[PDB]
Amino acid sequence: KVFGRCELAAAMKRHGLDNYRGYSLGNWVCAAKFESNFNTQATNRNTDGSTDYGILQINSRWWCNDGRTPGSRNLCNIPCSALLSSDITASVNCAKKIVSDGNGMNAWVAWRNRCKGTDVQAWIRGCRL
């Protein structure tokens, strides 16, 4: 599923991301835009052999199981394919664990390089929330 901008802000708000670990909603929408273009089915292979999955491009080196990432962990206790659902629940719940891991949203290099320090509230401007 390719979400609309406001559609995804609404879903993320419902799932409790607005100000989660102090990151306002727009940070999450900005991250999703640059990670996946709001596409829940996005997958991208990493140099190390892990893969990133879903709207927030959550990696199989640490967070999910895809059966093909040797030495990896599954700290979200989910199959990586759960992160590809049209329903963002599993991506959200796993993102909550990730952003609590020590480095906040810096865990998403795209957030750090494309959203951090910018006017992230633009990403929810206009939306009925």
Binding residues for substrate: 101
Residues after which the chain is discontinuous, using a C–N cutoff of 2.5 Å: none
The only residue of 19, 37, 77, 106 in contact with ligand CN(C)CCN(C)C, by rule CB under 6 A: 37
The angle that helices 5-14 and 25-36 make with each other, rounded to 10 degrees, is 130
> Taking the complex as a whole, how short is the minimal distance between the CB of residue 66 and Na ion, in angstroms?
6
42 C-beta neighbours (distance < 10 Å), count: 19
- Residue that is written with structure tokens 């633009």 in the block: 122
Residue 92 C-beta: closest distance to ligand CN(C)CCN(C)C, Å: 17
Give the nearer residue to ligand CN(C)CCN(C)C in terms of CB position, either 48 or 122. Answer: 122
Q: What stretches of the chain show up as alpha helix (H) in DSSP? A: 5-14, 25-36, 89-99, 109-114
Please report, in range form, the residues annotated as the binding site: 101
**Residues touching ligand CN(C)CCN(C)C, count (CB under 6 A):** 14
Per the CB < 8 A criterion, the answer to whether 63 and 99 are in contact is: no
Chain positions contacting Na ion, by CB under 5 A: 60, 65, 69, 72, 74
The site for ligand CN(C)CCN(C)C (CB under 6 A) is made up of 33-37, 44, 52, 57, 109-110, 122-123, 128-129
